[PDB]
Nucleic acid binder design. Structure first.
Length: 534
RNA sequence: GGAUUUGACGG
């Protein structure tokens, strides 16, 4: 790269840093500058400085010039995509294409640009799939072929609370033929090559994204999943099942199998359950990686016979699982009993017995689950009662949120334990961003109204402080909604005392309006008669 | 306007 080329692209960049140029002129300049990359796309896109300018040009230009750049760079696209800088240039080209998805006039021009890219990739895909940078480019490209532009953490595939909520039970048409063509190229390697794509972090990530994009496309899922699992009616022979089972503790493969189980059609799921997982459930649940596969398996069980097999292998070991930091397995099994309507009472009672070994300790089931890690990690479990000031346990509180969705017939120990907690522990729970969710789930349960009222009364004197919390303010709302006139007035009176500070907060204005705190202060008789009418 | 599992990811 000569200094004339450097100066040219740097001067373009400075020209955009100044806003002397209007939007229409800018996109024309972006297109002219792309022409200066012809015949040296690789050198410019992989330059550690100019790559950034090229990103700006690709996202600022119009569709025709973008497609011309993609067409002219296609023969070097894999090398660009596998470069530490060039990969961001490649992804900027994809993001820029994605901005035209909503334009129906753009369909065939986009499809042709995707074809030129997919064809060079399919010709030689395996090192790109395993490449730290190339794997990102491929994920984005797969998403674009599906027609999704909006980056989703889950698609790429990070954790998200939405995926946890889905696991715990709490669109543009795209270019379907291009997605199928690209993915089939990624999968047409030998069974032995596939065995190592399974355990390579970057190819596993590519295949995870592809499987998520194929959700509900059962005829494609039934073709692609047997290729990934090397077991090409869907049947897993005994020796292949052994190899799948033996790789389940690998960090890369375990993430892949989580996604397989999430998208698997019924027949394919049932075969994996029977041939791979059955009789190994507890061993896999104690492994630092495979236990997340078991969580996915549990969450997607299909019928009551499977629920019975899962309960027999795992419920006797609820205590072990909680002791060893595997509470998500327990949470998944409890949640799916609720969905499959099977073993509900057995799951709730097994959880109590796992946490409370003696009859007398059962009154403490709520505190111990709220602080699950402190209780199981403490020096002397016979004297532990609380963890003053500590942040409550996320998965323990999610378990409790699921508990309070059962029929009250199944969870009497939990209702009694929660409503028995003394005022200071209940207020501490309400002030916790996880504990507040437990209280709200109880308030929404079919526990008796007198039991709800008993708990709400023990929050009296603290509604003002709670309203100032971002999380606690929702709890004030839901207490208020569940109250009679007398307690609504008490809550309204407490918010009145902190009305100045409360209006400063993000939630304050909405809380003050929903409870009509101004009307209570100014016309209390009219406020009460409107409240008593609700 | 709200916490988000115990095991991965970039010039």
């Amino acid at each position: 790269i000569d200094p004339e080329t450097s100066k040219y692209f740097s001067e373009i960049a400075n020209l955009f840093d100044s806003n002397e140029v209007e939007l229409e002129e800018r996109s024309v300049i972006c297109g002219n500058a792309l022409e200066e990359t012809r015949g040296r796309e690789y050198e410019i896109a992989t330059d550690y400085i100019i790559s950034h300018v090229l990103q700006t040009l690709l996202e600022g230009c119009e569709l025709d010039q973008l497609c011309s750049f993609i067409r002219n760079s296609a023969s070097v696209f894999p090398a660009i995509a596998m470069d530490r800088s060039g990969s961001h240039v490649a992804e900027s080209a994809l993001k820029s294409l994605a901005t035209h998805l909503e334009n129906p006039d753009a369909y065939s021009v986009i499809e042709e640009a995707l074809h030129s890219i997919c064809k060079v990739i399919v010709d030689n895909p395996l090192d790109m799939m395993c490449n730290c940078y190339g794997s990102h480019v491929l994920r984005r490209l797969l998403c674009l072929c599906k027609g999704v532009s909006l980056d989703s953490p889950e698609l790429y595939g990070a954790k998200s609370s939405k995926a946890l909520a889905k696991r715990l039970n709490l669109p543009h048409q795209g270019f379907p033929g291009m997605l199928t063509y690209l993915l089939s190229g990624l999968l047409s390697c030998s069974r032995e090559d596939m065995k190592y794509l399974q355990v390579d972090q970057y190819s596993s990530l590519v295949l995870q994204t592809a499987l998520r994009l194929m959700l509900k496309q059962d005829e494609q899922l039934l073709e692609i999943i047997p290729l990934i699992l090397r077991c090409n009616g869907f049947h897993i022979e005994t020796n292949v099942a052994k190899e799948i089972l033996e790789s389940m503790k690998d960090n890369s493969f375990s993430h892949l199998v989580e996604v397989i189980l999430e998208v698997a059609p019924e027949s394919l799921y049932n075969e994996m359950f029977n041939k791979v997982f059955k009789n190994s459930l507890f061993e896999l649940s104690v492994d630092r990686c495979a236990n997340f596969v078991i969580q996915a398996l549990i969450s997607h069980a299909r019928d009551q016979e499977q629920m019975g097999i899962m309960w027999e292998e795992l419920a006797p070991r609820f205590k072990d699982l909680l002791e060893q930091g595997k509470s998500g397995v327990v949470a998944s099994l409890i949640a799916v009993s609720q969905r499959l309507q099977s073993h509900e009472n057995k799951c709730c009672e097994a959880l109590v017995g796992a946490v409370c070994s003696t009859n007398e300790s059962r009154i403490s089931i709520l505190p111990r689950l709220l602080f699950l890690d402190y209780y199981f990690g403490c020096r002397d479990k016979s004297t532990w009662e609380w963890a003053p000031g500590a942040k409550m346990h996320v998965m323990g509180c999610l378990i409790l949120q699921g508990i309070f969705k059962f029929s009250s017939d199944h969870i009497q120990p939990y209702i009694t334990s929660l409503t028995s907690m003394k005022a200071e522990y209940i207020t501490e729970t309400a002030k916790d961003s996880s504990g507040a969710r437990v209280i709200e789930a109880f308030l929404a349960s079919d526990a008796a109204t007198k039991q709800k009222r008993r708990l709400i009364i023990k929050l009296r004197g603290h509604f003002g402080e709670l309203s100032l919390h971002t999380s606690g303010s929702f709890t004030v709302e839901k207490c208020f909604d569940a109250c009679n006139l007398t307690l609504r007035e008490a809550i309204a009176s407490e918010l009145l005392d902190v009305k100045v500070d409360l209006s400063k907060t993000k939630q304050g204005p909405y809380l003050l309006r929903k409870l009509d705190i101004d009307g209570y202060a100014s016309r209390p008789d009219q406020w009460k008669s409107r409240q008593e009418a609700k």
